[PDB]
Amino acid sequence: EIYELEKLNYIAKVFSKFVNNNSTRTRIAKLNIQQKLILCTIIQSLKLNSDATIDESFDHYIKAITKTDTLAPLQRNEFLEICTILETCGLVSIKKTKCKGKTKRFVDKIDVDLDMREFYDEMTKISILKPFL
Amino acid sequence: LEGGALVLADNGICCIDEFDKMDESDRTAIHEVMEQQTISISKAGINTTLNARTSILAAANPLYGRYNPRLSPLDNINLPAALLSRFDILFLMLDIPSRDDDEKLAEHVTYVHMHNKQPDLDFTPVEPSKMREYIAYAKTKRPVMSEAVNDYVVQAYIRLRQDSKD
């Protein structure tokens, strides 16, 4: 019907839907240079391999941005919207995981589909994240 | 009572070549006229004060001659925090070898060693008397800051203090 719509061609059409953002279209997701900064900020918080909250990420985001003054520290509410820009492209997923203090209480743990090998290529082209590593 | 180099040069430029080659006795007297223009000396000869409005120009080199990128600048510079904290402008005139920019310095030194004339740019170098007269005419001016520049000054100072405040 594609040759009716235009009045293994399609398997070629369907696999590029799935393979990309890690090799090429990562920078498509982060046209904002701060979105590049906030993406490395998540991985620096992943050293403490814990329930990666949006606050503990915001903790490491402030305490690094006071050391290197690349930008002003932004809001948590801004930090809410910017990580959702990272979300809709399909890079990082957010789930409401478990903490069992009072009830089944839902803090948000993130997870990234990128590796440091596919990170280090796209950051050496920008020496402004080079203070942050 | 004989005198040094800070007393015959009262109102002007006092320069120091090889700043790190001096001692503590020179530094304690240089920092005293660097903070405020009055020197006071109380020795077996006299206990007196004297003023000397001077502008300190200093030329220094690091600990190992040249710089070190693996070393911090607080460790590269042997001067203490109170000395360069009083210094508002410090110029890190560092040389970096390049391919394109070194040729202009080489062309300029061969042009001034070929003859005394300067390069053929569309500008003429002014003689010492005219800008000496301009400096003497500009020195009587007393500028007053506005409020629109005041709100930019305090915001830049707050941001610089927070950025500087490792």
Q: Which amino acid is at B47?
A: N
Distance to chain B for A130, nearest Cα, Å: 15
Cα A114 from chain centroid (whole Å): 8
Strand duo A105-112 + B12-16: pairing: unpaired
CA B32/CA B35 separation, integer angstroms: 5
In the three-class reduction of DSSP (H, G, I as helix; E, B as strand; rest coil), residue B32 is classed as helix
What is the CA A44 to chain-centroid distance, rounded?
A: 12
Residue type, A16: S
The residue assigned the tokens 């004989």 is B2
Contacts of B100 (CB under 8 A, 6+ apart): none
Q: Which of B60, B61, B57 is nearest to B15 (CA)?
A: B57
Q: Residue B51: name the closest of B66, B38, B65, B32 by CA.
A: B38
* Closest C-alpha to B31, from B78, B77, B82: B82
Check if the beta carbon of residue B163 is closer than 8 Å to that of residue A69: yes
Which experimental technique did the depositors report for determining this structure? cryo-EM
Stated length of chain B: 166
| Closest chain B residue by Cα to residue A69 | B163
Cα separations (Å) of B64 from B60, B83, B90, B120, B134?
12, 20, 19, 39, 41
A109 in Cβ contact with A52 (< 8 Å): yes
Q: B7 vs B4, B31, B129, CA distance in Å?
A: 6, 15, 25
Structure tokens at B84: 């360069």
* Cα torsion angle, B93, B96, B97, B103, sign: negative
| CA B34 to chain CA centroid, nearest Å | 11
Instruction: Tell me B119's DSSP state.
Output: P
Q: What distance in Å separates the CA atoms of residue A102 and residue A55, rounded to the nearest whole number?
A: 20
List the single residue in B with minimal CA-CA distance to A66.
Answer: B163
- Token pair recorded at residue B82: 């109170």
Report the alpha-carbon distance of residue B84 to residue B105 in Å, rounded. 30
Q: Residue B52: in which H helix or E strand, if any?
A: none
Provide the 8-state DSSP code for A113: -
A42: CB partners within 8 A, 6+ apart = A52, A57, A83, A92, A110, A112
Residues forming a β-bridge with A95: A109
Angle formed at CA A38 by CA A33 and CA A43, multiple of 5 degrees: 130
B61 is in an annotated binding site: yes
From A80's Cα to the closest Cα of chain B, the distance in A is 24
Residues in chain A: 133
Q: Does A66 touch chain B (CB under 8 A)?
A: yes
